[PDB]
Amino acid sequence: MWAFPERFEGRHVRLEPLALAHLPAFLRHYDPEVYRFLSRAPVAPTEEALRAHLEGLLGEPGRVNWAILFGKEVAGRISVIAPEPEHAKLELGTMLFKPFWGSPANKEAKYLLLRHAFEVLRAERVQFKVDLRNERSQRALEALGAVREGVLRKNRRLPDGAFRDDVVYSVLKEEWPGVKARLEARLYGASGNP
Amino acid sequence: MWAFPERFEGRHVRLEPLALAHLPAFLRHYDPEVYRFLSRAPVAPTEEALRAHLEGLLGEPGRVNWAILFGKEVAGRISVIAPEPEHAKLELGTMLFKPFWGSPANKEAKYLLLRHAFEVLRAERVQFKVDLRNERSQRALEALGAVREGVLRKNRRLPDGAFRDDVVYSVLKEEWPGVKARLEARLYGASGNP
Predict the structure, then answer these.
(1) Single GO molecular-function term (chains A, B) (predicted)?
(2) Interface touch B172/A153, C-beta < 8 Å
(3) Do the Cβ atoms of B151 and A149 come within 8 Å?
(4) Nearest to residue A186, comparing CAs of A72, A85, A107, A76?
C-alpha cells in the first residue's frame, strides 16, 4: 500500500491527520452550503449529525484524510479516496469551511497532495469527482487544468431517494508539471502571494 | 443486498451460477483474443492460469457471475459487478468463447440480466466499462443503445506496467424500454429469430 506522510507544510497551510479532535472546528463552522454537494452530508445542523459525518470520513475503507490548518484554525479537510497502488491511481477531494472559501487553502492543500502523489508515489492518474450541480467546483477544476472526462449519469442516490450526476475530471502524470506550474503562479511569488 | 436468481431461461440460452465445475469449458476454448481486453486475463495458455482467472471472477467482492449455456455447451459468462443497491446501480459485463461470437448468446444474456435489474430490482443505472482498444464491444454497446459517457484515461494498469483507457457507457431506467425493444427485435420473432 502507499504510505503517506501524516503532515505536510506549505506556505499558507499545513496538513495533519484528520481526527475526532477536529470535530469542534466542524461544529464551529456549520453551513449547509459547504456540504450540499458532498456524499453523506450531515443530515441536520447538529453535533450528532456532524460527528456521524466525520466518523464516516475516517471510516470509509482506504480513505486517508488530513485536516487543513490555516494559521491557528482548521480550514477544512482534504481526502485521498480509493487509492489503488496496483493501478497507480487515486481520487482526491476537499471540503473547506465557508470563511475560507476564496483563500489560498484549497489550492495549496491540493498542490501538496498532487505533488506527493505524482512525484513521490508515482501515481499515473488522479481523479476528481463532483456533482454536476456543483458549478463552483467544476470551475475550480477547469482553472486547475484537470481534464473533464465525462458525466456519470445518476451515479449516486441521496437519502431522500433522488439521484445526482457526477462529473469526472483527471490529471495524468504527464500533465502534472503543467498543472503544478499554474498552481504555483497562483500560490507563490509576486504573482500568487504578493 | 439484492438477491438475484441462480437461473434464468431465455429462448436461445439459459444462465446458471458460474462455478469451478465450468472450468473444463474454459479449458476447451482458450483463445487469447477472448481475454485480451478483460481485466486479469489468464497469463498463459494453461489450466493453471485459467483456473486462477475463474477463481478471480468468483472471488471478487460483490461480483455475481453466471455461466451462459447455449444448448449443451457453456458459451461463456455474464457478470454483475459492484452492485450497489444503496445507489440503485451496478456494472454488467460478459465474455463469450470464440465459437459463440456472432451468436444470439451475448445479446440474450444481457437482455435477461438488464430486464431483471431494471424491472425487478429497480436499478436506475447499469454501467458498462470497456477498453478503449476493444472496438468490437464499443460497437455492440452503441448498437444496444447504451450512452457513451466518456473515457477514463489510464484507468487500469496491466501486469507488464502498461496503462489502458476505459470507455464508460450506461443505460438508465428511463432508457431501458427503448433498449429492450431493440434487443427483442434482434432476438425474437420473424425479425430476430427466423
Answers:
(1) identical protein binding
(2) yes
(3) yes
(4) A107
Residue in A closest to B168 by C-alpha: A152
Closest to A179 (Cα-Cα) out of A122, A110, A123:
A110
Give domain A1-194's CATH number out of 3.40.50.2300, 1.20.1730.10, 3.40.630.30, 3.30.200.20: 3.40.630.30
Distance (Å, whole) CA A36 – CA A53: 13
Query: What are the helix (H) ranges across B29-76?
Result: 32-35, 47-59
* A156 interaction partners in chain B (CB closer than 8 Å): 87
Q: How many helices (H) and strands (E) does chain B have?
A: 7, 8
Q: Which of A124, A154, A170 is facing B125, going by the closest CB pair?
A: A154
Q: Cell for A177? A: 508539471
CB spacing of A154 vs B172 below 8 angstroms: yes
Of B63, B62, B58, B77, the C-alpha closest to B14 is B77
Closest listed residue to residue A47, CA positions, set A60, A65, A68, A30: A30
**R_g over Cα of chain B:** 16
Q: What distance in Å separates residue B100's CA from the closest CA in chain A? A: 32
Query: What grid cell was written down for A55?
Result: 466518523
